[PDB]
């Protein structure tokens, strides 16, 4: 479970960008295709996203790089079946 978010805010010293990036991660985990990068402990996607930011393996930039790589893979594989 979670009580605070002070570590995550310490890692992202904005307190608002944290909400947006955590929301994006939770959305990616709920639609979702992707899977948690931290051992899930029977927690909803919000707590998982916040803990996963706490570990320091995701912020806005890392998530943007991952999305760019996923779009590149889609462009490539979709192209291979086309041409």
């Amino acid at each position: 479970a979670r009580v605070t978010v002070q570590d995550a805010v310490e890692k992202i010293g904005n307190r608002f960008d944290l909400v947006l990036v955590a929301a994006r991660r939770a959305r990616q985990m709920q639609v979702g295709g992707k899977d948690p990068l931290v051992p899930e402990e029977n927690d909803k996607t919000t707590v998982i996203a916040l803990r996963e930011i706490e570990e320091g393996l995701i912020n806005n930039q890392i998530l943007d790089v991952r999305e760019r790589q996923e779009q590149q893979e889609q462009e490539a594989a979709e192209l291979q079946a086309v041409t």
Partner: protein, 51 residues
């Protein structure tokens, strides 16, 4: 009908779903704050003494 299986579903979903408690005359921003629900038998909100 309030079967015996719905309560387990409610427990599963209430886990990490903060709710906002907001007294009537919300003078200042602290008048509304979020807490993680805990299932209580009764009809009255149990609010932490400090707040």
């Amino acid at each position: 009908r309030e079967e015996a299986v719905v309560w387990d579903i409610l427990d599963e979903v209430i886990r990490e779903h903060p709710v906002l408690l907001n007294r009537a005359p919300t003078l200042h921003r602290l008048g509304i704050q979020a807490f993680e629900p805990v299932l209580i038998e009764g009809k009255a909100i149990q609010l932490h003494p400090l707040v």
